[PDB]
Design goal:
The structure is a homodimer. The first copy, chain A, is α/β, with parallel strands linked by helices and 301 residues long. Chain A has helices at 26-37, 51-63, 88-99, 131-143, 157-166, 185-194, 212-221, 225-235, 247-252, 263-266, 293-297; strands at 3-5, 11-13, 17-18, 41-43, 73-78, 106-109, 114-115, 126-127, 150-153, 173-177, 197-201, 239-240. The structure holds cobalt (II) ion. Chain B: GO terms for molecular function: nucleotide binding; oxidoreductase activity.
């Protein structure tokens, strides 16, 4: 245990560093610290604006010889305003330019949601998605070698299946919120049935680490609650993207490999009440194709 | 060419008109197969459940021996019946079909229904076994890998069930063969098949006279205006929508008329009038809707396409 195998044959390291929009230098320093600590997987997104900063940190690691390019798994994501087929490869080339990379290991449709190119999330900018057309352009990016794998994020079982039905190249990954407070059992089983890998974002939830079931298991096994929450996801077969900028916790978040949650304690995760934390309010709207949260998540709520 | 063939997702060509076979009395179907191929049919559609594959195989042997046609010129389909869905039973059923047809390969092999009973039993509740379509499909895929079925597909699958299978399959179903005719136009599944690259073969393309599709006023009027028979109009409609058709005609003259569906067309204004024909599914699947079936309602079987 340290990798999962994608439907392309490629290995995805089971722990990656989740990134987000932060003050200058914060994410670049975290990426450097994480890779030095042993991380081999960095998850990015163009909408965070910080790909240039991450690219400088990767360049620093390469130049110091900490790792080589082929040692790392680098993900980024296509934002909602670049869904038009002609815009997809251009957006990927911008992410590659900023990361100073020749290819991504994984490129994801960030949301099943579309706005006009160059506009913000506001109802005058909403365009009905055409996921098959966007995917056809993702496939060309994959065929061209610019993305070793292509996938999606925030896709329900239903929307993932709708895409699998029309695709030539199967989505390799569905990256979704997943943690002991939102265990995604339906989508997990569906991903197993289709060979799609589930990557858990927000794997630490932060009330989730306060759950008595997690604190108790942590005490019994001599691990932190975060390590228990991360290990739970890995034992379910999911990669995880903990976000942290503290060197000590970055290193602890990696120690999730050589110990296991025993069956008796694993059973207790069914006692944790379930709630989706990132509900997607920003794209649920009377003028959105998703007028309710149930429409966006297809009942997975 | 001008829709004389359609291209499957395997790249193989399927002739757009084939002879639909059925369960008859000895000799009938073999004669029709011989007569159809002599008249120009290049596509013969069979099913093991009808028990007549040996008779069809003798007609094909006679066609090959007389030099009317070679094996490579014909597109031959058969189907896996509901009692052979167990993965061990799938290749054995295909080999029985091949043995009876006296063929080394089928051009197309279909799951006949999304439904399963114990091997060798009839459709009664005591014999039902919950389907495992992905597992059955996995065994179909092995037959495909081995070249015994050059294409594999399904029959009587709703858009939802076809989509559910497409999402797990390594080899995509090449065909969904369904009832489709002017009285049951299958617009939802037609659109879905286009979206997924699955070919739609229309069975009962004349509405099964042996009905009333051929007596619809819209069809009669279009037929008069185009100088063709109501049957030719019905068949041309399906072909113009991009579907193959499997008429069951045994009469030699109607068999030959069924091939005259290519050098003329239905104009855009008359095509629009097909919307006026009342819609009703004729093969409703009553035999597998049951309190003990996975399909408690007809709506569950057809996923709303009713
Ligand atoms: Co596929």
């Amino acid at each position: 245990a340290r990798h999962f195998v994608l439907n392309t044959g490629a290995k995805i390291p089971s722990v990656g560093l989740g990134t987000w929009q932060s003050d200058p230098g914060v994410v670049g320093d975290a990426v450097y610290t994480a890779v030095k600590a042993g991380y081999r997987h960095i998850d990015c997104a163009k909408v965070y604006g910080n790909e240039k900063e991450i690219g400088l940190a990767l360049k620093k690691l390469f130049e110091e010889g900490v790792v080589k390019r082929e040692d790392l798994f680098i993900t980024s994501k296509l934002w909602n305003d670049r869904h038009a087929p002609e815009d997809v490869p251009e957006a990927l080339n911008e992410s590659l330019t900023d990361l100073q990379l020749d290819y991504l290991d994984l490129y994801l449709i960030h949301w099943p949601f579309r706005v006009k190119k160059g506009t913000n999330t506001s109802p005058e900018n909403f365009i009905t998605p055409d996921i098959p057309a966007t995917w056809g352009a993702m496939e060309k990016c994959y065929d061209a070698g610019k993305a070793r794998a292509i996938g999606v994020s925030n896709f329900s079982s239903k929307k993932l299946g709708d895409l699998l039905a029309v695709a030539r190249v199967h989505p390799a990954v569905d990256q979704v919120e997943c943690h002991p407070g939102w265990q995604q059992t339906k989508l997990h089983n569906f991903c197993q049935s289709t060979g799609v890998h589930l990557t858990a974002y927000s794997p630490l939830g932060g009330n989730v680490l306060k759950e008595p079931v997690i604190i108790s298991i942590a005490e019994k096994l001599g691990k932190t609650p975060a390590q228990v929450a991360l290990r739970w996801n890995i034992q379910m077969g999911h990669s995880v993207l903990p976000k942290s900028t503290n060197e000590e916790r970055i290193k602890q978040n990696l120690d999730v490999y050589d110990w296991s949650i025993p069956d008796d304690l694993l059973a207790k995760f069914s006692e944790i009440k379930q709630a989706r934390l990132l509900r997607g309010n920003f794209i649920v709207n009377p003028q959105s194709v998703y007028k309710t949260h149930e429409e966006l998540w297809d009942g997975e709520l």
